Amino acid sequence: RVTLVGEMAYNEILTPEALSFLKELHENFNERRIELLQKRMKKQQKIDAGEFPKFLEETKRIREADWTIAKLPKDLEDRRVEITGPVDRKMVINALNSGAHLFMADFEDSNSPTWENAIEGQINLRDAVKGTISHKNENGKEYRLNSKTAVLIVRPRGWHLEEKHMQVDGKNMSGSLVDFGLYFFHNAKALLEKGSGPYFYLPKMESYLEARLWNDVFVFAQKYIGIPNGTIKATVLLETIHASFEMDEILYELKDHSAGLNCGRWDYIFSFLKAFRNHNEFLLPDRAQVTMTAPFMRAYSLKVIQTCHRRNAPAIGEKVRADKEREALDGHDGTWVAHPGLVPVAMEVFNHIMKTPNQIFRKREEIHVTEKDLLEVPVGTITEEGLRMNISVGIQYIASWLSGRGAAPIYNLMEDAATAEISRAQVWQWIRHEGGKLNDGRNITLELMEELKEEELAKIEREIGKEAKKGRFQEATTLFTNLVRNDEFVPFLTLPGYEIL
Ligand SMILES: [Mg+2]
Ligand SMILES: [Mg+2]
């Protein structure tokens, strides 16, 4: 028995037919999802005991074999620029019209997972696929879609999140299955008719078994609505240290439904810190100093490019321009932006270096990335500014998120949950580490964190105003403080955040 708990046009997405499909998703796959999350806890015990991720002996055959992913649709051949944004009505239109080749419509990191956002998200995407989506201004303006838009790709919540507003026999539904299920149900056939398809961005996976789970979901889904296997195309965000040792295996489990991999910065550095948080030598510098040229991040990107291109799949990626230029020269088939205005920038670099639709033919045969290359701790300094930035951005981001805005322009960077995660994670680590000391020599202590926290909160109230306040800063501050003070390390701030959201 299915219970719908949230307040309620929502009837049009939550139809008995759509819900019957979600119920079957749940009965088939939720328990496996929970099992895999339990396997993560077990793996953490092994890592804590000194057993690092490794290239698995058990899957050597997959790695030696000469298979490739299934053939990509034409609209996934050239992915030079992708833009990311939440499933907010106005942002969906701006992103689709941005000139990006693809738009990753986000239910995950840049989306605050309110019930309203989760279902309005689906309404908005349904209207976008139909062409009826519009955003009305009070001044009369009403934005609509170009007749040719960026290709739509959806990112659902990761496997650790639940949708507490629908239950099956009292057990919360998987956020992943809900976000994927409703978009698939309502749009797969229309997407096919316009010559595209149901495409996904799969986040935060830690194991190929988690890739298998997605694959099994796709198989069931296609069968359920009666379209052929191999029609769903999913790009995997290769964004956890665990996954860097299972890239090939991950593509393999998904091979009939694969559109390759994508590299990140913050979720990946977060993952690295979280996994090795009990290892004393894995102390990190200011996150700003941990750039894509840091040796372990370089090894990561190159291994993604080499693995993807080997399986005939895409590998998606002033200082911004140097950065994109490095990605193109290295062999990435495309790159990401989080704002409409930065498309031209990204577009220019890739149009100059990558005149071919992609560069999957670049095998990067000459490089060899070892396990040690992947694990090498980055060296730099920890700085008063970096510590103030971590505190300020963490709190402002969490206030924004509790206020229902998961895409937060802070110090004009478009920030998402991964920014806040690395922010809280660094402060948590620096307070604790014996080496957790500012550049000037000051010990990073609870007292200093607290005193710096007060000053930043004074500064925020000055930039934003007393009334803004209504932005749930009290709660954001409390949560951030609990996150950095708790010795246990909550796996994701959205876990406690979801409870109080
Ligand atoms: Mg991410
Ligand atoms: Mg240790």
Task: Say whether both 370 and 417 belong to one domain.
Answer: no
**Cα–Cα dist 33/38, whole Å:** 9
CA of 279 to the centre of ligand 2 (A): 3
Task: Say whether both 9 and 103 belong to one domain.
Answer: yes
Look up tokens 């096919």; give the residue. Answer: 192
Q: Write out the DSSP string of 198-213.
A: -EEEE----SHHHHHH
**Type of residue numbered 480:** F
CB atoms within 10 A of CB 336: 22
**Type of residue numbered 322:** A
Task: Say whether both 299 and 401 belong to one domain.
Answer: no
Show the domain range for 155: 1-380
Asked whether the beta carbons of 305 and 327 are under 8 A apart, the reply is no
Helix (H, G, I), strand (E, B) or coil at 103: strand
267 is in an annotated binding site: yes
Task: Say whether both 213 and 101 belong to one domain.
Answer: yes
CA of 474 to the centre of ligand 2 (A): 35
Which ligand has the minimum distance to the alpha carbon of residue 50?
2
Which ligand has the minimum distance to the alpha carbon of residue 282?
2
Helices of type H across 194-333: 208-225, 247-253, 266-275, 295-310, 319-330
**Type of residue numbered 426:** Q
**Cα–Cα dist 270/423, whole Å:** 9
* CATH code, domain with 134: 3.20.20.360
Task: Say whether both 363 and 422 belong to one domain.
Answer: no
**Cα–Cα dist 63/127, whole Å:** 42
Asked whether the beta carbons of 13 and 3 are under 8 A apart, the reply is no
CA of 435 to the centre of ligand 2 (A): 15
451 burial (CB, 10 Å; 0-12 / 13-18 / 19+) is: exposed
**Cα–Cα dist 246/240, whole Å:** 10
Strands 162-168 and 2-4: antiparallel
Which ligand has the minimum distance to the alpha carbon of residue 236?
1
* Experimental technique behind these coordinates: X-ray
CA of 188 to the centre of ligand 1 (A): 24
206 is in an annotated binding site: no
**Cα–Cα dist 65/2, whole Å:** 44
Instruction: Name the residue among 6, 273, 14 with its Cα closest to residue 165.
Output: 6
**Among candidate residues 328, 360, 380, the one where a domain is terminated:** 380
Asked whether the beta carbons of 172 and 208 are under 8 A apart, the reply is no
b/e per residue 387-410 (b: at least 16 CB within 10 A): bebbbbbbbbbbbbbbbebbbbeb
Asked whether the beta carbons of 421 and 160 are under 8 A apart, the reply is no
Q: Write out the DSSP string of 109-146.
A: TTS---HHHHHHHHHHHHHHHHT---EE-TTS-EE---
Task: List residues with catalytic annotation.
Answer: 155, 416
Sign of CA dihedral 422, 427, 432, 437: positive
Asked whether the beta carbons of 225 and 185 are under 8 A apart, the reply is yes
385 is in an annotated binding site: no
Task: Say whether both 473 and 396 belong to one domain.
Answer: yes
Task: Give resolution in angstroms.
Answer: 1.7
Helix (H, G, I), strand (E, B) or coil at 477: helix
Task: Say whether both 133 and 278 belong to one domain.
Answer: yes
Task: Say whether both 366 and 387 belong to one domain.
Answer: no
66 is in an annotated binding site: no
Q: Which residues contact 228 (CB under 8 A, 6 or more apart)?
A: 222
CA of 276 to the centre of ligand 2 (A): 8
**Cα–Cα dist 298/417, whole Å:** 23
**Among candidate residues 345, 380, 415, the one where a domain is terminated:** 380
**Ion ligand 2, residues whose Cβ is below 5 A away:** 278-279
Task: Say whether both 112 and 214 belong to one domain.
Answer: yes
* CATH code, domain with 434: 1.20.1220.12
**Type of residue numbered 124:** N
How far is the CA of 381 from the CAs of 277, 384, 455, in angstroms? 18, 10, 22
**Type of residue numbered 93:** I
377 burial (CB, 10 Å; 0-12 / 13-18 / 19+) is: middle
**Cα–Cα dist 324/197, whole Å:** 28
Asked whether the beta carbons of 192 and 28 are under 8 A apart, the reply is no
Q: Which residues contact 366 (CB under 8 A, 6 or more apart)?
A: none
- Beta bridge partners, 413, equal 410
CB atoms within 10 A of CB 20: 13
What's the CA angle centered on 21, arms 18 and 23, to 5 degrees?
A: 110
Total domain count for the chain?
A: 2
Instruction: Name the residue among 155, 173, 156 with its Cα closest to residue 165.
Output: 173
CA of 48 to the centre of ligand 2 (A): 6
**Among candidate residues 342, 363, 380, the one where a domain is terminated:** 380
Task: Say whether both 227 and 310 belong to one domain.
Answer: yes
Which ligand has the minimum distance to the alpha carbon of residue 281?
2
